[PDB]
Amino acid sequence: MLMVVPLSEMGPGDKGIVVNILGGHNARQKLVSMGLTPGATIQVLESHPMGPIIISVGGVRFAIGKGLAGRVMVRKL
Amino acid sequence: LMVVPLSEMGPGDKGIVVNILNARQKLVSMGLTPGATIQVLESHPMGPIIISVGGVRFAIGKGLAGRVMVRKL
Amino acid sequence: LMVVPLSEMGPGDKGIVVNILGGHNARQKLVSMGLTPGATIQVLESMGPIIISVGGVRFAIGKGLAGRVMVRKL
Amino acid sequence: MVVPLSEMGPGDKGIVVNILGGHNARQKLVSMGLTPGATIQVLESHPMGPIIISVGGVRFAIGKGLAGRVMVRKL
Amino acid sequence: MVVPLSEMGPGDKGIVVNILGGHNARQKLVSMGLTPGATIQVLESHPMGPIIISVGGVRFAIGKGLAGRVMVRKL
Amino acid sequence: MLMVVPLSEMGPGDKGIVVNILGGHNARQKLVSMGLTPGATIQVLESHPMGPIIISVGGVRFAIGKGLAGRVMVRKL
Amino acid sequence: LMVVPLSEMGPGDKGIVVNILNARQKLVSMGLTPGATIQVLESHPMGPIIISVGGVRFAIGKGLAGRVMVRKL
Amino acid sequence: LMVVPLSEMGPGDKGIVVNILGGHNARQKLVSMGLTPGATIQVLESMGPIIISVGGVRFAIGKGLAGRVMVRKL
Incomplete structure (x- = not known):
């Protein structure tokens, strides 16, 4: 099972x-x-219930809302 | 209620x-x-975001707006 | 426990x-x-303006204008 | 007679x-x-700004918020 | 086949x-x-820049110097 | 004697x-x-012979050239 | 030869x-x-400063130019 | 003590x-x-570009273009 999930579901x-x-x-x-x-x-x-989610991309930190994060499909490593 | 960066609000x-x-x-x-x-x-995706606060209108850049955490009603 | 104009606050x-x-x-x-x-x-x-802090930022405000701000004291 | 620059007319x-x-x-x-x-x-100077000022004969536009950081003795 | 973004045509x-x-x-x-x-x-892309690029379908203008910081495997 | 001198002459x-x-x-x-x-x-x-001069104005540091500094007349405190 | 910030050069x-x-x-x-x-x-007093370096022309803001120390020939 | 193209430097x-x-x-x-x-x-x-530092800033440069830069080695 390859795990492919929205970023909104990742912890x-x-x-x-x-x-x-x-x-x-x-x-x-x-x-x-x-x-x-x-x-x-x-x-x-x-991450929290209610957002936001804090991520790191290329060593840079961002906050993203759960809604927008639902649009990002990610394969877990 | 969700908390989102201002840049992401519609x-x-x-x-x-x-x-x-x-x-x-x-x-x-x-x-x-x-x-x-x-x-x-x-909101332009894009930017600037056009907002109203206390009845006054402002335009804010998407970069700056991405640092304002807002509890969406 | 009162609401007062900002102009009255200490x-x-x-x-x-x-x-x-x-x-x-x-x-x-x-x-x-x-x-x-x-x-x-x-x-x-507070001969001069009131010095306030909002969102961690310091401003000076005249007692005239400060009289228009109703504030519930904490 | 000390005022914020933001309230000067x-x-x-x-x-x-x-x-x-x-x-x-x-x-x-x-x-x-x-x-x-x-x-x-x-x-x-209007509600919303910017304020147009002159310092040493040079003209500048200052925002209303930043002008609220400056205390001036009126002459 | 690794090149600086600044030299890609x-x-x-x-x-x-x-x-x-x-x-x-x-x-x-x-x-x-x-x-x-x-x-x-x-x-x-011309000598002097900016370079016009597309990433994930979105268009951006990048300066030639900053593009010199990016290494790309050509496809 | 009040000392009134160009900024270029101050040390x-x-x-x-x-x-x-x-x-x-x-x-x-x-x-x-x-x-x-x-x-x-x-x-x-x-300051040096040859400039620049480093000054502080309102708590902010600037470098100025001796030439331009010759245009600033200062009363010493 | 004098050392001046680039913003001050003519x-x-x-x-x-x-x-x-x-x-x-x-x-x-x-x-x-x-x-x-x-x-x-x-140079505009003003800004931007227009310079040539190695035969190539650039416009630089007066603020940024004020941090470049140049030995004037 | 030589002048060489940047492309030859190590x-x-x-x-x-x-x-x-x-x-x-x-x-x-x-x-x-x-x-x-x-x-x-x-x-x-230095299959890839040369990584250089100029004015404290790091860049990547292709050996082609680096061949146009004559450099007196220190």
Whole structure:
């Protein structure tokens, strides 16, 4: 079982590779500015019920909302 | 209620500023301080985000907006 | 436990903005210092203006304009 | 007669007597000549800003928030 | 077949494999999607720059110097 | 004897108040951006033959060339 | 020869970059690194300063230029 | 004690740019990495590009383009 899950479902300590961004144009532009494009590696640093999620991409930290994070499909490493 | 960065909110969305993650004065002077009520009027994905705080309209860059954590109503 | 105008608050007093008096021009002037309903404000000092801190940022405000800010003291 | 620069109107003149804020604020303000002892005249000011000022004969636009960091003795 | 992004021509595609520089450089570059594993296509590039690139379908203009910090495996 | 001298002639440790900027328009605009306008206080922090001079104005440090510094007339404190 | 900040040099002036007093990459990529020869073509008091380094023309902001120490020839 | 193209320099080598070969386009390409006559350059490492440091800033340069930079080794 390969684990392919939305970034919104990943928890502190998880790492993975982005495989797909859901939602075309506006979504891609909102996400690419946090380095979230296919092939980038993400580590989840912190998360709560209610968001936000704190991630690290290429050594840079970002906060992302659970909603937008649902559009990022990640294969866990 | 979800907490999201201001840059991710849509037009029409309202929220309460929770916290800011140097541009501090700049942010405070657009009303963006913990407890304030904001409404997003326009987001470009893109940027700037156009918001209203306390009935006053401001345009904020997407980079800066990404550091404002907002409790979405 | 009172709501008072910011103009009446003393050094060290902390409170929550609950009401801005006096129209769009007043609101436009005050939001430059973070003063909108819900914001937390501390008076640091009061012949001169009041020195306040909002969101960790220090500003000077005249007693005239500060009289338009209703604040619930904490 | 000490006022925040942000509340000075068109035509008002004064001397800067105090700057609030850290190094960051002082650096921004000194780029517009705003340091203790400098003379400032407000040229145009509306609710929303920017304020148009003149310092040492040079014109600058200052935002209303940043102007709220500057205390001036009115002349 | 590893090249600096700054030397890639119009039409060249590749995968970012390394970013040079400190936190500052990484932050600027991640704002344009440039992180290890990302796919980049150069759209226009002249001596002087900026280079026009596309990452994840989004277009960006990158300066020639900053592009010299990005190593890409050409495809 | 009141000491009124160009900033170019002042040495590390000197403090004074700017009294006059020589040269009208272009000079004033170049200098006001370092806080050098009449009434500002300057401290000289470092100087050499050949420049530059390092000053502090309102707690902010600037380097100025000896040539431009010749246009700043200062009353020593 | 005098050492002056680049922002203070006039059109026609040439110099050698001595040293820089974060924008480091930005500066290096306009050729502004110790030992380079620069010519000032235009200064606005004002800004930007227009320079030539190694035969290539750049415009640099007055703030940034004020941190480049140049040995004036 | 030689002048060599940057393309021939090894890890740790330091030198002074003395000549750029190949016209305005070459010069325009190289100045983006600080490479103009007089600049000091260090080679950090050489299937891939050369990694250099100029003015404390790290860049990658292809051996093709690096062949146009004449450098007096220190």
